[PDB]
Amino acid sequence: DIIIATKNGKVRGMQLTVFGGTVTAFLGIPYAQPPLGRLRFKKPQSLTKWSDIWNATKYANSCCQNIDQSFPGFHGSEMWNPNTDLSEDCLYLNVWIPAPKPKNATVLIWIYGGGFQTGTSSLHVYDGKFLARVERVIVVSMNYRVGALGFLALPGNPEAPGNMGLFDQQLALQWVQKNIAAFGGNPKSVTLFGESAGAASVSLHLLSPGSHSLFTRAILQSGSFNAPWAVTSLYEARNRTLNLAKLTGCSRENETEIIKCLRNKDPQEILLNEAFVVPYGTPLSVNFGPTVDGDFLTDMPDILLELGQFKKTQILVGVNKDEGTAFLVYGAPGFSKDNNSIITRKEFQEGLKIFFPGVSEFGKESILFHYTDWVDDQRPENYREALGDVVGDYNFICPALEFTKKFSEWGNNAFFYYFEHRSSKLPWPEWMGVMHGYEIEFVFGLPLERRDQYTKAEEILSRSIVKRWANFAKYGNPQETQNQSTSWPVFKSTEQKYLTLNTESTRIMTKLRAQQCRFWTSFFPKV
């Protein structure tokens, strides 16, 4: 029986057997008042205290969200859907600690992605018990509000100020600062890690002055806030909140009255209307996301980044080889997960209209010009591959590389990786390659479980990544020092060294996607 006294009252955890050892899991500890009734769309309010023992022995409710129903019955998409009940009452977090209880362990805090519209901390691929067992770190993860309920903004109105889900994340970081030592953790050694919108969130904690003293360092897997889907302008945010009011019968002349009417709607009516607040969207649309609220975020984040106004610390950033392919089967014409998706030039063109809907004809022709000068045979897959690369370079890889360059120019060590291993169990088809999201299970150590039929080469790859990530959290340096491994060099402007992650051989390379990123970074923003 493991019972821990926190600042809000006692919590009871449970013992898990993991690889011949034990891990103690405390699943579903509350970290804020449930944001119901009058609290809907406000910043999270802090917890009052319980007398008695809170049983943290099962995952809590996931936050309200739309679900992906594009492939019912299919593991490749269903594994990202929420696996506990959906509820507005969803502000909880999970703690995994080594047994015996550690003395001052480094803490890894995971922030899930999902476009800021979806996601939950309870998915199988985010289970922190392997990292706790193998590296003797404490792993923490939280649920945070998503969609309009997390990110609706009428900027400057404290009834719906924006960024509520980022404030939920921040309050969970505060919870670790105040309580993690009772679990054996060191509040002075806390690394954030997250993937896609979870990575963009981590990068915004580097910018937010209220997060500055709540963590030590940061890991960004496939995402950063300069990615084109990550931050909503003030103008589109007010537009979208007003469209949402229109669609739900809540248009009013007084803005505080709009919010009060939105607070009377059942969650389902809000969720049903979210897709439509925008005149056209894409597979990557973030309808309700982070905004410049003058609170969490004090200025446009591209200005803060450019002028060095962010926490000075080490970062670990990287991307997967085929980031853009997952998105093509959610609307590009000619694509299917159930065939080889060979498309024509005309299809490629229609595909750019799907992913770049507000963009000029010239802008879309510029994309086609840059990506279709082929090397070289008339390969059938030319256009299929070009579209996946357009979408992955624009939305993920070039923005991660630009973020890492700009961050590292202010004097801190940064380490960049390119993940290029396709999981032997991947249920999506071969043409999609090394997809977005599919490094996560290697990071959390799932291939360390021999019972699961990953290959031996994947066990070794995951074991090495897990060690590099734990060394980065503990020591700021993501080396694997014992097994004659390739040394991971810092990423600097000028040389731009990165490390490739694969089952065969790790290589130091330079200037990832140089010619493509010059296009997206220096030309495309003009268009």
Next chain:
Amino acid sequence: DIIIATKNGKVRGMQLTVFGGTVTAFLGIPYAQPPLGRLRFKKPQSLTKWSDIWNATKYANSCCQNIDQSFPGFHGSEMWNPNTDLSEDCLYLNVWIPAPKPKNATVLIWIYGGGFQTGTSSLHVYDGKFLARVERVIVVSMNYRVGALGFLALPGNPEAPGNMGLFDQQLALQWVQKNIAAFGGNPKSVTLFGESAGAASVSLHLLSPGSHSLFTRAILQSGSFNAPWAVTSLYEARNRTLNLAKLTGCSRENETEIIKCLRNKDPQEILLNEAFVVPYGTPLSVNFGPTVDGDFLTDMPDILLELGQFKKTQILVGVNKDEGTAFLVYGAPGFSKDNNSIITRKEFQEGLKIFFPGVSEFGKESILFHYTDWVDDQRPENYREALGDVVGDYNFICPALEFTKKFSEWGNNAFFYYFEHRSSKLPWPEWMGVMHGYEIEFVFGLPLERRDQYTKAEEILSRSIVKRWANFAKYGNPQETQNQSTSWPVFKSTEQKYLTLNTESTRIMTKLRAQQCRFWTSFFPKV
């Protein structure tokens, strides 16, 4: 009559006449609860306070340990045996201060070696009264638990957590921080110094976060924790504790019950079985030594060293010219202290099987290949010398040089020496050369006593070493500034300058044992 008020009560010392002056010695002050009954194998518990005056006028009990009986009646080995009664009640320390009492003197804290299995602070060659008299420093030394009683580990179980003897050392450092100012010492100027396992211990205090604020700088004579005998893996430590239980009738299903049964054994039954917890050992076997306990030591020490996770301060490190020869007469065939030990090739081969018992045939042939390409005459002593060098390079010299390189790469000044003077009184035979352990008496100033029949050249050598060591403790710089001495340069990666210590002429040289250390450091660990 000198009486000093400490935080635990009054202590009475005694006056010694040393070289026409006086030194005050306080021998045998307790610094912890005697670790008896239920405290056996636990961390040391702090002292409660005595009313009345503790008489610190004789050396205290040495900790329980096996004794070297290989050469009864022979000074060369008997001088390292304990010279006070053996007892589990042995947690005491000694303080030597100058008279008149100094104002804010620098403090040197000696940690004895002995493989972590043997040793005591009361040996003649560790008598701190000469350093106190000549350099006006305070010298402190402690007894710490050795063998299973100091280092038994069931890792993570606080009944036998491991590293107890390192925690004994640490508590004695805490005792100096809290009490040394009452003796005239400066707690902000404390240098640790130790030899062999005492040096490895000092290097682990550089790694341990709980020792960080307990000392200023460090001196490592013939030892460091990366030496192959210095740290036991978790796996061999549990194996050995379980073998010990088996041999004493204490095997149980519940681990806490194993410990409780071990607590009922008389010390002698424990000591008698220590040699046997391992299927074969060598003259250098450390059956119960430091382990990674998650407390004193938070991670494998090679990782901490490599990634710069250690106290940033100056170090003084060095080795003796013939470190490995002392060990050859404790089991290598053909060797004897009573003849010239000329051995054959076959003997050399059998000798590698004695010192490298778990090592593959290929591994042992690699040693022979590297050390027997002779320059050049068919000298009878070729194989005798090669074996002493194998054992001294592998176990002491290459690991001290690698430790000093890796430490100095993080920006701190380090100074390396090579001691090459053989004492004119050495009772071992000439072929053993400048043996392991035989710089100690020069460091503590024993040749300054003219009554003892060292030569005049040895008086001057010791006087110069004593001054360099005191200057290093006081000022971080081991110069002898007044007598046109060779200037001791910092040891850097790249140049690797070291200073030779001898009676004739001091030289600055570079890259000590370069070709040999490349073998032991970059190749042998693979084998």
Next chain:
Amino acid sequence: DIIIATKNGKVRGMQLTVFGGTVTAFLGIPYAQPPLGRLRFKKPQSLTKWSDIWNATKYANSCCQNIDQSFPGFHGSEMWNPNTDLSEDCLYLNVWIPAPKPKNATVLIWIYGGGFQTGTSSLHVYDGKFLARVERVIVVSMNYRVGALGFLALPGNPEAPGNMGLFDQQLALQWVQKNIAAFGGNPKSVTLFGESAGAASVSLHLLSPGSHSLFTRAILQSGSFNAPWAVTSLYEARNRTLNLAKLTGCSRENETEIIKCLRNKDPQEILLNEAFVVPYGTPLSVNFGPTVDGDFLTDMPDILLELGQFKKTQILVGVNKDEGTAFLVYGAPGFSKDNNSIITRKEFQEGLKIFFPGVSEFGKESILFHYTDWVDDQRPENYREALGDVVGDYNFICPALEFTKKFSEWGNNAFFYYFEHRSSKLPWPEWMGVMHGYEIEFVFGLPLERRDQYTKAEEILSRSIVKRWANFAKYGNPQETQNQSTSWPVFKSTEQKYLTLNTESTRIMTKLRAQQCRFWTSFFPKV
């Protein structure tokens, strides 16, 4: 009526008219218990408090000292004799402040020289009213005990521990830290300045840990503690205290009894015997001076200097062109202030025996070899000039340059000057040139008084020196910025730039006395 409340009680000062303005002088404030009866030869004890107003309107008693009677009636020597009554009751200091009272003025604390045997703060040439008036700084000066009464040492015995007069200086610095703000001064901007033994004293405050927080920076005029007369070894100090006991009837077996008998002697009997505690002395003999006491001075000062163990701050150091000439008329044969002192080779030789009495024949021939290879005519004055240069290079100039090199190698800015102006009023004869002591009146601004018949060129020179010294105290940089002056460059090892001070033109030069100093610094100490 100006009355100031200090921590010990009220003091009343007096108003002076200086150059059409007013200065407030508080002359003779006590800063310690009078060191009489049982306090004779002990460290100064702090003051108890007076109720009522202490009238600080006249200079206090000078400390007991022998007087220079070599030239009665002659201003050149009499101006250095004490001008108030001699008394053991002499621990007082003087404060000059600008009117109106300043707000947070920089403070200059003057320490007089006199061989540690003589001197007083009340001499005309140390009158601080000109500096207070012209630069609006506060000037402070103290009387400190000299001769045996200041410096008798039985090292380690607190009845006569040594360095009492340095402790008197230190207690006066403490007095300024605690009280100077009530006078309008800034305790965080305090520069020490002193000449000859006053400069050596200032250099020892840079070494003493108890002085470290009592001042900001330092000015050394003609003196430093590495000069050969400045620090007495432990062995000659005990010898001299024992000779003093012998000559006064005070030899005893118990050392504390020797001191008690010395405490019963009238001061005059002590003063009468001081010349004789040494078997031969010279014009530069310091019979009772600073020693290594383990309190004020924790180690030999050459070791501390060499290994960088001193306060890190800026220094201003310099010497006069003919430092050694003043001493030649106090015993070298053939010399007289009343004729041109042309001497022969034989006289030069006898002269070296007067100044280097314990030195070998070889040592004295080495001096003659180095200084008599003439460039070149057979000039009658060759030997007269060579002797003045021997004495000035050995005792003042080479040691000031070595001190400045060694100090500046640890990273701080130092500025060196060579003063080469002979005062138009100098009462000594022309052949003595720019004598020791005769920059002082330029530093304190005496030529600013037009009524005194210095030349116009001397008024301008003094005005520029006064500005450079005040800028150094206030800003750490001794520039004169307004009058197209030569910029004073920092003195570095390697280039060794210094600034010449004269009425004609200021020059930047390099490597002052290079060939001579190599002789005194690297060869002579061996002899």
